[PDB]
Amino acid sequence: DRVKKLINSQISLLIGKGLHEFDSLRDPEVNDFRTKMRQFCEEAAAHRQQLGWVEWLQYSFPLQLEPSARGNRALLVNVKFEGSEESFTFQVSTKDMPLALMACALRKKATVFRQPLVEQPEEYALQVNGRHEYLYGNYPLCHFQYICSCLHSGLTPHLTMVHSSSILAMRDEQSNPASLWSLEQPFSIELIEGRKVNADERMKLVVQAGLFHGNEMLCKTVSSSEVNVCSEPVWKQRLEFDISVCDLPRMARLCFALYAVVDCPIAWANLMLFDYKDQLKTGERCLYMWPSVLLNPAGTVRGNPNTESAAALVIYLPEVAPHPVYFPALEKILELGRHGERRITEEEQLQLREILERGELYEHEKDLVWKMRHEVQEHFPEALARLLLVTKWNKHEDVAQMLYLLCSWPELPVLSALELLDFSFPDCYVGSFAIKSLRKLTDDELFQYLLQLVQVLKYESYLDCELTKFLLGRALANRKIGHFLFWHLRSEMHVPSVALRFGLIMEAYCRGSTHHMKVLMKQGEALSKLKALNDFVKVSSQKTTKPQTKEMMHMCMRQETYMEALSHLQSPLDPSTLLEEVCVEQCTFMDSKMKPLWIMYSSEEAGSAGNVGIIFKNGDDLRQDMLTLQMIQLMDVLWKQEGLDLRMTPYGCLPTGDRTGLIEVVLHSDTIANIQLNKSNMAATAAFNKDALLNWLKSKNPGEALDRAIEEFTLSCAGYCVATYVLGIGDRHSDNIMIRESGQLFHIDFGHFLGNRERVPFILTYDFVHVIQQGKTNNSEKFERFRGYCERAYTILRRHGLLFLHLFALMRAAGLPELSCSKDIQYLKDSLALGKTEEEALKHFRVKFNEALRESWKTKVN
Numbered sequence: 001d002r003v004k005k006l007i008n009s010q011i012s013l014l015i016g017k018g019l020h021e022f023d024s025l026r027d028p029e030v031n032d033f034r035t036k037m038r039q040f041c042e043e044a045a046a047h048r049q050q051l052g053w054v055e056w057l058q059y060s061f062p063l064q065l066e067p068s069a070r071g072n073r074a075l076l077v078n079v080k081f082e083g084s085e086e087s088f089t090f091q092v093s094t095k096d097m098p099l100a101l102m103a104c105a106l107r108k109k110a111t112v113f114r115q116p117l118v119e120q121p122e123e124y125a126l127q128v129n130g131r132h133e134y135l136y137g138n139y140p141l142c143h144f145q146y147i148c149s150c151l152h153s154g155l156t157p158h159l160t161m162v163h164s165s166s167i168l169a170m171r172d173e174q175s176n177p178a179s180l181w182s183l184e185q186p187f188s189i190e191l192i193e194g195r196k197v198n199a200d201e202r203m204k205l206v207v208q209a210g211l212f213h214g215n216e217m218l219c220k221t222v223s224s225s226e227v228n229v230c231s232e233p234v235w236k237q238r239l240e241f242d243i244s245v246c247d248l249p250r251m252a253r254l255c256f257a258l259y260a261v262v263d264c265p266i267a268w269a270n271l272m273l274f275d276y277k278d279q280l281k282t283g284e285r286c287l288y289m290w291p292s293v294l295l296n297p298a299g300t301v302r303g304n305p306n307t308e309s310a311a312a313l314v315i316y317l318p319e320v321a322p323h324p325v326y327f328p329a330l331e332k333i334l335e336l337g338r339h340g341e342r343r344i345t346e347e348e349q350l351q352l353r354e355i356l357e358r359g360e361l362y363e364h365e366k367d368l369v370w371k372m373r374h375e376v377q378e379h380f381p382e383a384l385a386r387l388l389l390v391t392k393w394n395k396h397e398d399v400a401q402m403l404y405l406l407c408s409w410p411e412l413p414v415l416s417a418l419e420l421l422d423f424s425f426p427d428c429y430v431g432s433f434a435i436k437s438l439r440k441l442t443d444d445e446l447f448q449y450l451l452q453l454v455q456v457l458k459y460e461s462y463l464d465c466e467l468t469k470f471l472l473g474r475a476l477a478n479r480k481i482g483h484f485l486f487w488h489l490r491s492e493m494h495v496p497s498v499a500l501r502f503g504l505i506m507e508a509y510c511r512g513s514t515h516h517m518k519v520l521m522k523q524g525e526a527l528s529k530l531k532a533l534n535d536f537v538k539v540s541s542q543k544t545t546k547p548q549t550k551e552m553m554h555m556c557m558r559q560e561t562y563m564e565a566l567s568h569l570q571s572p573l574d575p576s577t578l579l580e581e582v583c584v585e586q587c588t589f590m591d592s593k594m595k596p597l598w599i600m601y602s603s604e605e606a607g608s609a610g611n612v613g614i615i616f617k618n619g620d621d622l623r624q625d626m627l628t629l630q631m632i633q634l635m636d637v638l639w640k641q642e643g644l645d646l647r648m649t650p651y652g653c654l655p656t657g658d659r660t661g662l663i664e665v666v667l668h669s670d671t672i673a674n675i676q677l678n679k680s681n682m683a684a685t686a687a688f689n690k691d692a693l694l695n696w697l698k699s700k701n702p703g704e705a706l707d708r709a710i711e712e713f714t715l716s717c718a719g720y721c722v723a724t725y726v727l728g729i730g731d732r733h734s735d736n737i738m739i740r741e742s743g744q745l746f747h748i749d750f751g752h753f754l755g756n757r758e759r760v761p762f763i764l765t766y767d768f769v770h771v772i773q774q775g776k777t778n779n780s781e782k783f784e785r786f787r788g789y790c791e792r793a794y795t796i797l798r799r800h801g802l803l804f805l806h807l808f809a810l811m812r813a814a815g816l817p818e819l820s821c822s823k824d825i826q827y828l829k830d831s832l833a834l835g836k837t838e839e840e841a842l843k844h845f846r847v848k849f850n851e852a853l854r855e856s857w858k859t860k861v862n
C-alpha cells in the first residue's frame with residue numbers, strides 16, 4: 001500500500017540515507033541481512049503488541065532503581081488520578097511499597113466520591129508527573145530513583161494513578177501497521193594493478209600484505225617489488241605466504257598497504273578470505289582503498305564507498321579446486337577435535353595454577369597451558385582467554401581441538417565475556433560463546449555497557465552477526481535500550497566506514513517499532529532546527545552585541561516552524577524526560593568558541609520537575625566527553641553498591657550527528673570561575689577571595705542548611721578528585737569545575753584523559769580544602785574525614801579494576817585519538833595500581849595524596 005512507501009521514506013530521512021542506496025549496491029550480503037533482520041524485527045513487534053499491561057510497562061518504561069536495590073522514615077507523597085486536578089497528599093513510609101500507596105489513594109477516592117471502589121490497587125501503576133517514568137513492582141518506595149531523588153532535595157514526589165486500561169490503550173495506539181582440509185598448497189594471491197594512485201614521482205610504489213587472525217599474524221608479511229610511482233601501476237606478481245590453504249582460519253583477513261619509498265604511506269585495504277556464506281573467495285577483486293593517516297588489521301574489511309577519489313588495488317584470488325570450497329561445518333570440526341591427548345605431577349600443576357592466577361607469558365609457559373587445556377576447562381574455566389591466546393590459530397588441527405573444548409565450555413561470568421568481545425579474540429564461535437554468556441546481562445547492566453557493545457560492531461567482519469541480533473533483540477524488548485542504540489548508530493552516519501552497517505541496523509530496528517521511529521523523527525526535526533538556529537547565532541555573535549543576537553534568536557524561535565519543531569518531544573538525552581513548552585525568554589547561547597545554545601523547557605503537568613534544559617553543541621567531537629561521563633557514572637554505581645554515595649553529577653552528554661550533540665543543563669549551578677569573580681552588591685561579596693565560594697554556599701544555604709551543603713561539597717569533591725586521578729583528567733581550572741546550590745561540586749568539558757602523554761598527579765585545590773575545613777585554617781577532623789572518602793572511593797574502584805580495563809579495551813574500536821593504543825590502557829593499570837596488593841596500592845595512593853597536599857600548601861603559605 002501507500003503506507004509501506006511512506007514508512008520507507010520516513011526511515012530514509014530518519015537514518016540520513018535513502019533506502020534505494022541499499023538496493024543500488026546489488027550486494028547479496030546486504031540484501032540477505034535486510035530480509036533476515038526485517039523478519040526477526042517484525043517478530044519482536046508482534047510479540048510486543050500482545051504483552052500484558054505490566055509487561056508493556058517493563059518494555060516502554062523500565063524501572064529506574066537505586067544501584068543498592070539491584071539484583072523506617074516518614075515520607076510525604078502527592079497522588080492524583082489520571083485526568084483529575086484534585087490531588088491527595090498523604091504520609092507514607094519509605095519502606096512501604098507502591099501497592100500500599102495505591103490502595104491508600106483508592107481509599108481516599110472512595111471517601112471523597114462517597115462510593116466503595118470496584119477498582120483494586122492491582123489494576124494500577126504510579127506515573128511520575130509529566131514524565132515517561134513509572135513506579136511499579138515489589139520494591140519499597142526508597143528503592144526507586146525518583147523517590148530517592150525527592151528525599152535528598154527535600155521535595156515531595158508527585159504521582160499519578162494510571163489504570164491498566166489507559167496503559168493497554170498506549171500499547172494499542174503504538175502498534176505497527178496491520179574440502180579445505182585436503183588443500184596442502186601454500187596460500188597465494190596475484191597483485192594485478194593499481195588505479196587512481198597519487199604520490200611523489202621520484203619515489204617507488206610497494207604493496208605490503210599480511211595474513212591476520214584479528215591482531216596476530218598467521219604468517220610473516222610479504223612485500224611486492226618496487227614499481228615507479230604513477231596513477232596506474234602494473235605489477236603482475238604471485239605473492240606467496242608461508243601458510244597452507246587448509247590452515248587458514250575461518251576469520252582470516254588478507255590486509256594490504258600501499259606506500260611510497262625513496263617511508264610515505266598512501267593507502268590500506270582489508271578483506272575476509274571466506275565470504276559471508278563460508279565459501280572460499282576466488283576471482284578478480286577491486287579493493288577501493290582507504291587513505292592512510294604499517295598494516296591495519298583492525299580496520300574495516302569493506303571497501304571505500306568513494307570509488308571516484310579512492311586509489312584501487314586489483315588482486316586475483318586463485319581457483320584452488322574445480323568446485324566451490326566452504327569452511328568445514330561445526331560437526332566436521334568437532335569430529336576432528338574429539339581426538340587428542342589429555343597428566344603431569346603435582347609440582348607442574350602448581351606451575352599452571354600460579355600462571356592462571358595472574359598478563360604476558362614466555363614460550364615454555366605457552367607449551368604447558370596448551371597440553372593442560374583439558375584441566376583448564378575442568379578446574380579453571382574462567383582462564384579461557386589465556387588458553388585462547390596460546391592456541392595456534394594457523395594450525396587447523398589445533399583450532400579443531402580448541403573448538404571441541406569451547407563447545408562444551410561452561411557459561412562464564414559477564415566480566416569474562418566482555419573480554420572475549422575484544423578484537424584479540426576474532427573467532428566466530430568464540431564471539432558466539434561470549435554473546436551466549438552475555439544474555440544473562442540485566443537491562444541495567446546492558447544499558448551501562450551499550451556504548452562499548454556498539455563500538456565492537458566496528459570489529460565485525462560480516463553484517464549478519466550474533467552481536468547485531470543480540471543488540472536488536474534487546475533494543476526491541478526495552479524502549480530505552482532502543483532509544484540509545486539508535487542514537488549511538490545515528491551519530492556515526494557521517495563516518496563512511498560504518499554508515500552502511502549502522503544504516504542497515506537502524507532500518508531493521510525501525511521495522512521493529514514504527515511508533516518509536518516516529519518519536520525519533522520528532523527528535524531529529526528539533527535537532528535540524530537547532531543546527532539552523534546555532535549556525536545563525538554563530539554568524540550574528542561575530543557582528544553585533546549579545547542582547548541583539550539573543551533577541552534575533554528569540555524571534556527565529558518564535559516562528560511557528562520552530563515552535564512546533566522544538567516543542568513536545570522526548571529528550572534525546574533521556575527518553576523519560578519530556579521536553580514540552582520551549583521557554584523562549586529563558587533560552588540563550590554561551591560565549592565559548594562554538595556559541596552553544598542554552599534551551600529551556602517547562603511542563604505544567606510535571607511542575608518544577610518539568611523545568612529542564614538542553615545545551616545544543618555544534619562544532620565539537622562529544623564522544624570522549626560522553627565516554628568520560630559514562631565512566632564517572634559507573635564509578636558512582638560501584639561506590640553506591642558498597643553503600644558509598646559521593647553525590648556525583650554525571651549529567652547527560654549525547655553525540656547526535658557530525659560534531660553535534662546535546663548536553664544536559666544542570667540547573668542552580670555556576671562555575672567556580674563565575675563565583676570567584678567576587679562581584680559587588682551580591683549576597684556573597686567577600687573580604688578575601690578565599691571566602692567567595694563559602695560565602696556563595698552560605699547565601700544559597702541559610703542556617704542549618706550550610707552544614708549539609710559543606711558535606712555535599714566534601715563528598716562530591718572526594719569522588720571527582722578520585723575520578724580525575726584514575727581517568728587522568730588534566731587541564732583542570734576554575735571555568736571547567738562547577739558547583740550546585742546544594743553544595744555539590746562537578747567537572748565539565750572533558751577534552752583530555754588518560755594523561756594525554758604526562759602523568760596527571762592527584763589534585764587538591766586550596767579553594768576546596770578551605771570549604772571542606774568549613775572556612776577554618778586548621779580542621780583536621782573535617783580534612784582527614786575527606787581523605788577517608790578519597791581512600792574508600794579509590795579502594796572500591798581498584799576491586800573493579802578489570803571491569804574498567806575491559807570496557808576501555810572495547811572502546812579502542814571508537815578510534816578516539818586519546819584511546820588508540822596499549823599505552824592508553826597502561827595509564828589505567830598504573831592509576832589503579834593493579835600490579836600491587838591493597839596494602840601496597842594504599843601506601844602508593846597516600847604518597848600521591850600527600851604530594852598533592854604539599855602542592856595545595858604553595859597556596860596556603862601565600
Ligand SMILES: *C(=O)c1cc(-c2cc(-c3ncc(CN4CCN(C(C)C)CC4)o3)c3c[nH]nc3c2)cnc1OC
Nearest residue numbers: 588596598617625663664665666669670671748749750
Ligand atoms: C560545551 O559548551 C560544553 C558545555 C558543558 C556544560 C556547561 C555548563 C555551564 N558552563 C557555564 C555555566 C553556568 N552558566 C550559569 C548561567 N546560565 C545562564 C543561562 C543564566 C548559563 C550557564 O554552565 C553546564 C551547566 N549545566 N550543564 C552544563 C554543561 C559541558 N561540556 C561541554 O562540552 C563538552
